[model samples]
Target: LKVGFFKRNLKEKIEAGRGVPNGIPAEDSEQLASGQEAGDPGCLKPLHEKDSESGGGKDG
Candidate 1:
């Protein structure tokens, strides 16, 4: 499954704060996998980058 921008950003933050840059350890995955495995429920949704006219946001 493809990861959304928000999810990617969250992953990056988690990595930055407590994870390694290059590779994610299996244990870490095990822990975080619960969230993903549970279907990313209650996770912060990602904002669409498209223009407002396109139903995302203003071009300006």
Candidate 2:
């Protein structure tokens, strides 16, 4: 089962990359602020950079 706080953590990670909490790329974060684009859902950079962005991880 998915953790109850998963969504919130996911949102944080996206912003760490400078993107919106939804699923926009960091390069187009603000440009797509009012809307959105699709990619690997927060993979504009390497996975190791963030904790749970790979879809599974514990809080620090």
Candidate 3:
């Protein structure tokens, strides 16, 4: 069951990436806008970098 769900999700993601007309909807527009805002470098970059440098296993 889990594998089936994962396969279905992968197909949907591929179709969305391919820009299939049916794969996009108004709901995604709002979500993408919100995602863009969440990607703000000034707000997220320094904290993320510090956390990775301080606690990330690779740094140790």
Candidate 4:
């Protein structure tokens, strides 16, 4: 997946209240103390699975 696309999608979900856990396991207090240091946004993956109709259908 492209880095820009991943970051854009992740940011969108976070703003939309569907935020997934930051792949980094930093505690809220730690992040707050460090000003929420921006990690590699590209490291994040899409939480939503592809639509079942979009070639993502389950195979028996």
Using TM-score, give the best candidate's number: 3
TM-score (C-alpha) between model 2 and the true structure:
0.21
Against the reference, the lDDT scores of all candidates come to: 0.33, 0.35, 0.33, 0.30
Of 3 and 4, the candidate ahead on lDDT is 3
Shift in Å, residue 7, candidate 3: 38
Off by over 4 Å in 2: 1-5, 20-60
Best by lDDT: 2
Residue-level lDDT for 2 in candidate 3: 24
Candidate order by TM-score, highest to lowest? Answer: 3, 1, 4, 2
Q: Could you give candidate 1's per-residue lDDT for residues 2-57 as a string of tens digits?
A: 43545544444443354333332344434444344444443323322111112211
- Tell me the deviation in Å of residue 51 in model 2: 20
lDDT of 2 by residue, 1-60 (tens): 432333445555544443333332433334343133233454432232332242221221
| Clashing residue pair totals per candidate (backbone < 3 A) | 2, 0, 0, 0
Candidate 2 clash pair list = none
- In terms of lDDT, the poorest run of 10 residues in model 4 is 51-60
Writing each residue's lDDT as its tens digit, candidate 4 over 1-60 gives 553434444344343343344333323333332232233453332322111112111110
Task: For model 1, state the Cα shift of residue 4 in Å.
Answer: 3.7
Model 4: what TM-score?
A: 0.22
> Candidate 3 at residue 50, lDDT?
28
Pick the winner on TM-score between candidates 2 and 3: 3
